[PDB]
Design a protein around this motif. Structure first.
Motif, PDB file in Angstrom:
ATOM      1  N   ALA A   2      14.161 -34.970 -21.585  1.00  0.00           N
ATOM      2  CA  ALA A   2      13.962 -33.932 -20.580  1.00  0.00           C
ATOM      3  C   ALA A   2      14.322 -34.450 -19.194  1.00  0.00           C
ATOM      4  CB  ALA A   2      12.520 -33.424 -20.612  1.00  0.00           C
ATOM      5  N   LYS A   3      15.407 -33.921 -18.632  1.00  0.00           N
ATOM      6  CA  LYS A   3      15.933 -34.376 -17.353  1.00  0.00           C
ATOM      7  C   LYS A   3      15.885 -33.234 -16.351  1.00  0.00           C
ATOM      8  CE  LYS A   3      19.064 -38.015 -18.976  1.00  0.00           C
ATOM      9  NZ  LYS A   3      20.471 -38.420 -19.234  1.00  0.00           N
ATOM     10  N   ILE A   4      14.791 -32.468 -16.379  1.00  0.00           N
ATOM     11  CA  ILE A   4      14.697 -31.261 -15.566  1.00  0.00           C
ATOM     12  C   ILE A   4      14.689 -31.604 -14.078  1.00  0.00           C
ATOM     13  CG2 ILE A   4      12.170 -31.232 -15.946  1.00  0.00           C
ATOM     14  CD1 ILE A   4      14.538 -28.173 -15.434  1.00  0.00           C
ATOM     15  N   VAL A   5      13.995 -32.673 -13.689  1.00  0.00           N
ATOM     16  CA  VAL A   5      14.048 -33.080 -12.291  1.00  0.00           C
ATOM     17  C   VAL A   5      15.057 -34.207 -12.053  1.00  0.00           C
ATOM     18  CG1 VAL A   5      11.786 -32.171 -11.788  1.00  0.00           C
ATOM     19  CG2 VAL A   5      11.908 -34.371 -12.785  1.00  0.00           C
ATOM     20  N   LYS A   6      16.355 -33.843 -11.977  1.00  0.00           N
ATOM     21  CA  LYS A   6      17.454 -34.600 -11.371  1.00  0.00           C
ATOM     22  C   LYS A   6      18.722 -33.763 -11.159  1.00  0.00           C
ATOM     23  CE  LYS A   6      17.071 -37.990 -14.201  1.00  0.00           C
ATOM     24  NZ  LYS A   6      17.253 -39.325 -14.800  1.00  0.00           N
ATOM     25  N   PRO A   7      18.795 -32.954 -10.106  1.00  0.00           N
ATOM     26  CA  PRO A   7      20.087 -32.381  -9.713  1.00  0.00           C
ATOM     27  C   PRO A   7      21.048 -33.478  -9.281  1.00  0.00           C
ATOM     28  CG  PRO A   7      18.301 -31.113  -8.776  1.00  0.00           C
ATOM     29  CD  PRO A   7      17.691 -32.365  -9.340  1.00  0.00           C
ATOM     30  N   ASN A   8      22.336 -33.183  -9.409  1.00  0.00           N
ATOM     31  CA  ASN A   8      23.379 -34.191  -9.278  1.00  0.00           C
ATOM     32  C   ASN A   8      24.543 -33.574  -8.522  1.00  0.00           C
ATOM     33  OD1 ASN A   8      22.091 -36.354 -10.674  1.00  0.00           O
ATOM     34  ND2 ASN A   8      22.528 -35.304 -12.602  1.00  0.00           N
ATOM     35  N   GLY A   9      25.659 -34.303  -8.458  1.00  0.00           N
ATOM     36  CA  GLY A   9      26.872 -33.691  -7.958  1.00  0.00           C
ATOM     37  C   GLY A   9      27.274 -32.549  -8.866  1.00  0.00           C
ATOM     38  N   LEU A  36       4.112 -31.831  -6.410  1.00  0.00           N
ATOM     39  CA  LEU A  36       5.209 -32.526  -7.077  1.00  0.00           C
ATOM     40  C   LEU A  36       6.119 -31.636  -7.917  1.00  0.00           C
ATOM     41  CD1 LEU A  36       4.737 -36.034  -8.697  1.00  0.00           C
ATOM     42  CD2 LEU A  36       6.109 -34.410  -9.949  1.00  0.00           C
ATOM     43  N   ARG A  37       5.715 -30.422  -8.308  1.00  0.00           N
ATOM     44  CA  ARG A  37       6.546 -29.660  -9.239  1.00  0.00           C
ATOM     45  C   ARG A  37       7.803 -29.109  -8.577  1.00  0.00           C
ATOM     46  NH1 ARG A  37       2.106 -26.346  -8.307  1.00  0.00           N
ATOM     47  NH2 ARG A  37       1.077 -27.118 -10.207  1.00  0.00           N
ATOM     48  N   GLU A  38       7.776 -28.893  -7.266  1.00  0.00           N
ATOM     49  CA  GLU A  38       8.840 -28.161  -6.597  1.00  0.00           C
ATOM     50  C   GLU A  38       9.930 -29.056  -6.029  1.00  0.00           C
ATOM     51  OE1 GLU A  38       5.923 -28.782  -5.340  1.00  0.00           O
ATOM     52  OE2 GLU A  38       6.098 -29.233  -3.203  1.00  0.00           O
ATOM     53  N   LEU A  39       9.763 -30.368  -6.101  1.00  0.00           N
ATOM     54  CA  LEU A  39      10.667 -31.306  -5.459  1.00  0.00           C
ATOM     55  C   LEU A  39      11.021 -32.425  -6.423  1.00  0.00           C
ATOM     56  CD1 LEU A  39       8.796 -33.530  -2.896  1.00  0.00           C
ATOM     57  CD2 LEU A  39       7.653 -32.163  -4.468  1.00  0.00           C
ATOM     58  N   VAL A  62      17.039 -34.347   1.703  1.00  0.00           N
ATOM     59  CA  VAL A  62      16.408 -34.686   2.985  1.00  0.00           C
ATOM     60  C   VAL A  62      15.119 -33.909   3.268  1.00  0.00           C
ATOM     61  CG1 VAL A  62      16.826 -34.895   5.454  1.00  0.00           C
ATOM     62  CG2 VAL A  62      18.614 -35.490   3.835  1.00  0.00           C
ATOM     63  N   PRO A  63      15.061 -32.567   3.133  1.00  0.00           N
ATOM     64  CA  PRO A  63      13.740 -31.921   3.268  1.00  0.00           C
ATOM     65  C   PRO A  63      12.774 -32.362   2.187  1.00  0.00           C
ATOM     66  CG  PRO A  63      15.354 -30.367   2.457  1.00  0.00           C
ATOM     67  CD  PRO A  63      16.112 -31.556   2.896  1.00  0.00           C
ATOM     68  N   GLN A  64      13.300 -32.527   0.978  1.00  0.00           N
ATOM     69  CA  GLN A  64      12.519 -33.143  -0.070  1.00  0.00           C
ATOM     70  C   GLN A  64      12.186 -34.585   0.258  1.00  0.00           C
ATOM     71  OE1 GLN A  64      14.462 -32.483  -3.809  1.00  0.00           O
ATOM     72  NE2 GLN A  64      13.813 -30.342  -3.907  1.00  0.00           N
ATOM     73  N   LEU A  65      13.006 -35.284   1.056  1.00  0.00           N
ATOM     74  CA  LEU A  65      12.603 -36.617   1.500  1.00  0.00           C
ATOM     75  C   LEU A  65      11.336 -36.564   2.320  1.00  0.00           C
ATOM     76  CD1 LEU A  65      14.170 -39.814   2.653  1.00  0.00           C
ATOM     77  CD2 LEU A  65      13.019 -38.576   4.368  1.00  0.00           C
ATOM     78  N   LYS A  66      11.268 -35.669   3.308  1.00  0.00           N
ATOM     79  CA  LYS A  66      10.047 -35.596   4.112  1.00  0.00           C
ATOM     80  C   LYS A  66       8.838 -35.247   3.248  1.00  0.00           C
ATOM     81  CE  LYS A  66       9.947 -36.284   7.718  1.00  0.00           C
ATOM     82  NZ  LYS A  66       9.729 -37.647   8.271  1.00  0.00           N
ATOM     83  N   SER A  67       9.040 -34.364   2.267  1.00  0.00           N
ATOM     84  CA  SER A  67       7.941 -34.017   1.371  1.00  0.00           C
ATOM     85  C   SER A  67       7.537 -35.180   0.456  1.00  0.00           C
ATOM     86  CB  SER A  67       8.310 -32.780   0.563  1.00  0.00           C
ATOM     87  OG  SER A  67       8.476 -31.659   1.411  1.00  0.00           O
ATOM     88  N   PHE A  68       8.476 -36.049   0.061  1.00  0.00           N
ATOM     89  CA  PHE A  68       8.083 -37.316  -0.562  1.00  0.00           C
ATOM     90  C   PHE A  68       7.350 -38.225   0.410  1.00  0.00           C
ATOM     91  CE2 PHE A  68      10.939 -36.174  -3.931  1.00  0.00           C
ATOM     92  CZ  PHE A  68      10.584 -36.912  -5.020  1.00  0.00           C
ATOM     93  N   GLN A  69       7.786 -38.254   1.675  1.00  0.00           N
ATOM     94  CA  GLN A  69       7.228 -39.192   2.646  1.00  0.00           C
ATOM     95  C   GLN A  69       5.748 -38.924   2.840  1.00  0.00           C
ATOM     96  OE1 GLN A  69       9.457 -41.787   4.493  1.00  0.00           O
ATOM     97  NE2 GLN A  69      10.174 -41.110   2.494  1.00  0.00           N
TER      98      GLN A  69
END
Lengths: 186, 129, 83, 150, 83
Positions: A2-9, A36-39, A62-69
């Motif tokens: 299950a690779k649901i959380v990894k968008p790519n090129g 955590l589910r949305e990012l 990057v917006p997901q970066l701030k949400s990880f931060q």
């Protein structure tokens, strides 16, 4: 897997399902599903650092970066616990744009997409719990330059053993070498 | 009011070298200053230097060696062809054995020996010997 | 000095100041050259060796010969390094 | 030194190196924007809004919190002042001096100072004309300036 | 002194200089939690404040603006925060 959380090129998931799976049994955890589910992540590397030590780099939008931060220290604690013997850092995916030479209707390159700004932002994001309080770039007699970065002396107990991993990671994905110090209070 | 940061940098270097000091703080920084200092440091006239990053224009702390006589600037950047480089060498440099003229060319900022080697001209930044 | 064949064409090679690295000229009568005695590690007796410093007249007229000789003595392991 | 004074004064603000929002500031971006909107509707200038937010709300720099500056926020909300505030204050000062001068005609010092104020007004207006903040036909007329100010 | 080290000054010399003219400039001002008696909440008054700040609950004056530094009113605890 299950690779649901990894968008790519578009395509590439190069056997790095380990991080996605690890986040997937960091489902049903204590008080972490509200944030955590949305990012999600984009890519992960398992580069070599120092001696036999290994460090893993996780690339985030990057917006997901701030949400990880905002939740990074807890997640990195138990994710290092799962991936024992390795260090984890979180870096944005920053999209450097090339410098326009004298060679249809292109737009003006943003200042945040320049390589200087991108390398500064990478260095800032790499050391997250501590804050950069100075920079002491030094030209050592050969044309070669060593950067010296001063950390905030308030997270030294939290992060003082990762400085060689920081140096190796910054050498790997930027090309230049850094040292990290903790000065006396200002 | 400060039309030239390279002029003030080289004047500060010159004055503190004449006073016998061991380090100089060069107050406004720019990459022309850094390239000039890199030429001067590769040729052995100054020591290490360190750029101090505040989020304004930086500062540079230069280590002096005692090997510097004069590091002046040329106040308009006169455009120099390879034919006219000999004339500037005679006017500016103390001999044909030592001393350099720093030009900026399209191949980079470099001394005059390298500029004659690479068959290029440019605008003259300054001299040092 | 050092013409292309290789020999040295100079009357002599002048001294350089050990603080400011300037040439001590033949008519600089304010410029000193001072030897500082060494002692052995065990009993502190003079063992016959010394270290030599030269100061030009300009430094010795500024008033900075004291601090310069003190720093040179730090650098050469003379007395303290923590004084 | 000063534009129109013989002063070499050195006093200004020294912004710190760290641009990060402090951890103790429990104010996010949008409610800080709401405080900006409230103060601007109360009739304050961007300088005054910044002074109040610094003095009694903990916001040292709104550019580090919100991401942009006070006048940009007011312009995006569509309630930025029609004249720039420094040009406004210069015209206000000119009007005060001119009224005093017409009741006190022997004040040659005030005449000299009014010349200085109006020179500064004209230099500032030329700058704002080049940046299209003012209309190209804008012109500081002394006779109708008082109806614009105060 | 000819060999003053210009990029490692002592913290007392760093504090002694102007707020500019340092290696990296830094303000001499700070923020602080001001607590007045008879209320429960705290306020985050700036040290060099120019406004007459008021507690929102009890309409009382916390600090009076002076030439350089806000003068807090009669007895009120203040805690300088994050240094």
């Amino acid at each position: 897997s299950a690779k649901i959380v990894k968008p790519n090129g578009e395509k590439p998931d190069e056997f790095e399902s380990g991080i996605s799976q690890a986040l997937l049994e960091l489902e049903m955890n204590s008080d972490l599903k509200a944030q955590l589910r949305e990012l999600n992540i984009t890519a992960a590397k398992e580069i070599e650092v120092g001696g036999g030590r290994k460090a893993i780099i996780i690339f985030v939008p990057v917006p997901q970066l701030k949400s990880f931060q905002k939740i990074q220290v807890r997640l990195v604690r138990e994710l290092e616990k799962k991936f024992s013997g390795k260090h984890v850092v979180f870096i944005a995916q920053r999209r450097i744009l090339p410098k326009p030479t004298r060679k249809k209707n292109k737009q003006k390159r943003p200042r945040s997409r320049t390589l200087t700004a991108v390398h500064d932002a990478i260095l800032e994001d790499l050391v997250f719990p501590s804050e950069i309080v100075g920079k002491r770039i030094r030209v050592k007699l050969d044309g070669s330059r060593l950067i010296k970065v001063h950390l905030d002396k308030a997270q030294q107990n939290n992060v003082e053993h990762k400085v060689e991993t920081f140096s190796g990671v910054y050498k790997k994905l930027t090309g230049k070498d850094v040292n990290f110090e903790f000065p006396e209070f200002q | 009011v400060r039309m030239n940061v390279l002029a003030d940098a080289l004047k500060s270097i010159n004055n503190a070298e004449k006073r016998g000091k061991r380090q100089v703080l060069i107050r406004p920084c720019s990459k022309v200053i850094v390239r000039f200092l890199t030429v001067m440091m590769k040729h052995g006239y100054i020591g290490e230097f360190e750029i101090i990053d505040d989020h304004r224009a930086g500062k540079i702390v230069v280590n002096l060696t005692g090997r510097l006589n004069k590091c002046g600037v040329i106040s308009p950047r006169f455009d120099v062809q390879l034919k006219d480089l000999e004339k500037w060498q005679n006017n500016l440099l103390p001999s044909r054995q030592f001393g350099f003229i720093v030009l900026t060319t399209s191949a980079g900022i470099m001394d005059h020996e390298e500029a004659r080697r690479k068959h290029t001209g440019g605008k003259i930044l300054g001299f040092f010997f | 000095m050092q013409n292309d064949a290789g020999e040295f064409v100079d009357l002599y090679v002048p001294r350089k100041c050990s603080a400011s690295n300037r040439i001590i000229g033949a008519k600089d009568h304010a410029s000193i050259q001072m030897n500082v005695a060494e002692v052995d590690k065990v009993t502190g007796r003079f063992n016959g060796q010394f270290k030599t410093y030269a100061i030009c007249g300009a430094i010795r007229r500024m008033g900075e010969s004291d601090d310069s000789i003190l720093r040179l003595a730090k650098a050469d392991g003379i007395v303290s390094k923590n004084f | 030194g000063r534009m129109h004074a013989p002063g070499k004064g050195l006093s200004q603000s020294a912004l710190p190196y760290r641009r990060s929002v402090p951890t103790w500031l429990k104010l996010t971006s949008d409610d800080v924007k709401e405080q900006i909107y409230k103060l601007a509707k109360k009739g304050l200038t961007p300088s005054q809004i910044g002074v109040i937010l610094r003095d009694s709300h903990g916001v040292a720099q709104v550019r580090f919190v919100t991401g942009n500056k006070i006048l940009r926020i007011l312009k995006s909300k569509g309630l930025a002042p029609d004249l720039p505030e420094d040009l406004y204050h210069l015209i206000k000062k000119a009007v005060a001096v001119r009224k005093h001068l017409e009741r006190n005609r022997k004040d040659k010092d005030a005449k000299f100072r009014l010349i200085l104020i109006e020179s500064r007004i004209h230099r500032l207006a030329r700058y704002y004309k080049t940046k299209r903040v003012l209309p190209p036909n804008w012109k500081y007329e002394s006779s109708t300036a008082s109806a614009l100010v105060a | 002194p000819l060999a003053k080290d210009l990029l490692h000054p002592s913290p007392e010399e760093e504090k002694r200089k102007h707020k500019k003219k340092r290696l990296v400039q830094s303000p001499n001002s700070y923020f602080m939690d001001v607590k007045c008696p008879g209320c429960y909440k705290i306020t985050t008054v700036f040290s060099h404040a120019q406004t007459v700040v008021l507690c929102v609950g009890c309409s009382t004056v916390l600090c009076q603006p002076t030439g350089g530094k806000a003068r807090l009113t009669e007895g009120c605890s203040f805690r300088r925060k994050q240094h």
